[PDB]
Ligand binder design. Structure first.
Ligand SMILES: *[C@@H]1O[C@H](CO)[C@@H](O[C@@H]2O[C@H](CO)[C@@H](O)[C@H](O)[C@H]2NC(C)=O)[C@H](O)[C@H]1NC(C)=O
Ligand SMILES: *[C@@H]1O[C@H](CO)[C@@H](O)[C@H](O)[C@H]1NC(C)=O
Ligand SMILES: *[C@@H]1O[C@H](CO)[C@@H](O)[C@H](O)[C@H]1NC(C)=O
Ligand SMILES: C[As](C)(=O)[O-]
Lengths: 375, 378
């Protein structure tokens, strides 16, 4: 008949799978028979066209991770599926050997966790001389799993190793140890920021984002780490002895400059301060779409609308029957600065599916039309 | 040491998995040595406490679907994880053989999709004699994939069957046909009263979702003059309608959209009583805390302690307290009383009262939790 390809059911944008499990992707497309399908991984063809609407992997590997989409096609045109990100849960091995490290007495000893490839990033347990060190007033484990020993004393000399656990597959790995030496001290020590918060960008609508600030001082029991936004002492979302600030449901009211302040209570020392900036990445959305079907007349000049917004400002890109217009290099097609597609001297071969994509760092959206050219 | 258990990371609320794949759940707890763990499935123990922070199913079955959570424990107290819903993707076979069905000429043929169990609910396409059946003015396909042929005629008789495709494991199935017979009766010149052949049901929807849809399909003769209209509080709705007025979609519903909706079918220019059906739409606002306790609390012996916990939501969330992963109803401690606001009220504080107090607020739309560790000193 005369039904162009469309999708009855659309894939989830992101999905996490375990290595060794089976993955079945589906091209849930409808249209006039016969329908043909082919699959793309990271925008590279995996298969030729076929009647097979599925892409199966019996046993997933780290390497299978990335972006998947199908192309459905019949005699009327071709259409890209919304892409889906397969994220494969995996844990490599620790890639570093034994290290030796020294810190001055009273100073913070910073021991980075040895490098390890893992999705997602793992949680860690640090050990001092074979014994678990939970976080405390004097022990900080950063969001990047670094062990910060504040106000180091002689007994802090020892061996430190880290055990990492992937929370999706349960793998655990054990690092090579770090030997820490402490060098020689009764005097108080002004607050210094040892791990500063960094600038942070997060996709709009997310559940939470956490800022972290770790300071040294002595006596550490009188060290006080607090967060200010616009000079306002932040009172909720605090934990980890003041070192972590969780912003829940970050919106524009939460963007901007946060400040962490470290004071040594009761002292005349100057407080230590560090700034950090939070930005919201807003995924793209269309502010204008074409009709699903457009009738055009030969020699007529056509304008197919497509407008998008997003933060950062999205890039718009057109496809005709799953071929990008840049590749077609059709001298009668022109993309306008608003995103709309301008066709002149409309011809019968212009009929087919024109599909618009808008995307930035935060996601991708698509819309499409079938153009019919008669007479 | 002196670190009570808490969770470094909390599991995803819902997760889909394929039958035959490996499931690994984790109890990502922090706390002083020694941490032990145990696991629950639909609030029933699967294991005793052990050093195993993992729960693993080598090959999933449908029956492994449900809610899972761990309890973590050290010498200081015990803490309940936020629960997760494991959904198993599968598709059974069709549970019915060949069916035969009879309608009289001009009556509506309501043909249910043949029963098949599957998660998620499959994509269902209707077919007749090798050809695909599209919705039209006369042909409706309900939200439950029921096929409705309004005002049947002789060409409507035939063999109808569905293709069901599961979009998570990609398995396809084809049912055995329903053979529809159109019987002739000697009054096809006379008009038929409007009748609702597929009624709208009650519907519950979590607030703030983008849209929920009610559906009401009616028959009459001449079906040309049939009118389906939607009314709320006696006033005919003029927007939010689609699919020839058979579908009413409420977009971003709030408490203001709760209540009863009536669909009404008339035969224009007739004096027939209109067919009416009621549907009840409930907007569920999931629970959220408006008050939470401090993460750690130091009380004096003999003190009367008020631990806060307050929640808001529609319906009003019910609050339940645990001490060290034991519900207070099982403890039956006469010094523990839960205030109507939801707060926990402890009188004559005792050294054994020390531990983790965990407050749960839940309704039909979800469950939320907060907790504290209580120290009792002299
Ligand atoms: C749809 O919901 C209404 C209420 O939300 C249900 O009707 C109630 O049924 C209980 C049962 O005893 C009665 O006590 C109430 O008085 C009824 N209320 C009303 C307004 O009728 C109704 O049964 C539900 N119907 C379906 C099909 O779920
Ligand atoms: C950690 O992994 C090793 C293999 O790398 C395994 O033998 C051991 O059982 C695991 N332990 C835990 C607590 O998961
Ligand atoms: C963080 O952002 C500010 C302004 O937005 C910039 O000046 C500063 O250099 C950034 N910090 C970095 C890049 O470390
Ligand atoms: C809901 As899933 C397929 O990311 O486990």
């Amino acid at each position: 008949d005369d039904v162009p390809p469309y999708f009855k059911t659309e894939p989830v944008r992101t999905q996490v799978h375990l290595e060794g499990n089976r993955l079945v992707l589906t091209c849930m497309a409808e249209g006039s028979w016969p329908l043909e399908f082919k699959w793309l991984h990271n925008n590279r063809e995996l298969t030729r066209f076929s009647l097979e609407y599925r892409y199966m992997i019996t046993s997933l590997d780290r390497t299978h991770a990335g972006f998947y989409r199908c192309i459905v096609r019949n005699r009327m045109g071709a259409l890209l599926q919304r892409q889906t990100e397969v994220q494969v849960a995996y844990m490599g091995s620790f890639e570093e050997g034994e290290k030796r490290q020294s810190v001055n007495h009273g100073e913070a000893a910073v021991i980075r966790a040895p490098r390890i490839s893992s999705f997602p990033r793992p949680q860690v347990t640090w050990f001092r001389d074979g014994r678990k060190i939970p976080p405390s007033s004097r022990i900080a484990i950063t969001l990047e799993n670094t062990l910060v020993i504040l106000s180091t004393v002689a007994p802090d000399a020892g061996r430190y190793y880290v055990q990492a656990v992937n929370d999706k597959n349960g793998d655990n790995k054990t690092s090579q140890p770090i030997t820490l030496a402490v060098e020689n001290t009764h005097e108080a020590m002004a607050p210094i920021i040892v791990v500063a918060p960094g600038n942070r960008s997060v996709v709009a609508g997310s559940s939470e984002t956490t800022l972290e600030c770790i300071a040294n001082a002595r006596p550490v029991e009188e060290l006080s780490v607090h967060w200010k936004r616009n000079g306002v002492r932040l009172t909720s979302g605090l934990h980890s002895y003041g070192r972590r600030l969780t912003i829940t449901n970050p919106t524009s009211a939460d963007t901007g400059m946060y400040v962490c302040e470290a004071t040594l209570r009761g002292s005349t020392f100057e407080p230590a301060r560090a700034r950090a900036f939070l930005s919201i990445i807003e995924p793209p959305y269309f502010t204008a779409e074409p009709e699903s079907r457009i009738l055009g007349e030969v020699e007529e000049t056509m304008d197919i609308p497509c407008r998008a917004m997003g933060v950062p400002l999205p890039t718009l890109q057109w496809y005709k029957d799953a071929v990008p217009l840049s590749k077609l290099q059709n001298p009668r097609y022109k993309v306008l600065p608003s995103g709309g597609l301008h066709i002149q001297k409309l011809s019968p071969e212009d009929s087919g599916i024109f599909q618009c994509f808008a995307s930035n760092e935060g996601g991708e959206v698509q819309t499409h039309t079938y153009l019919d050219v008669t007479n």
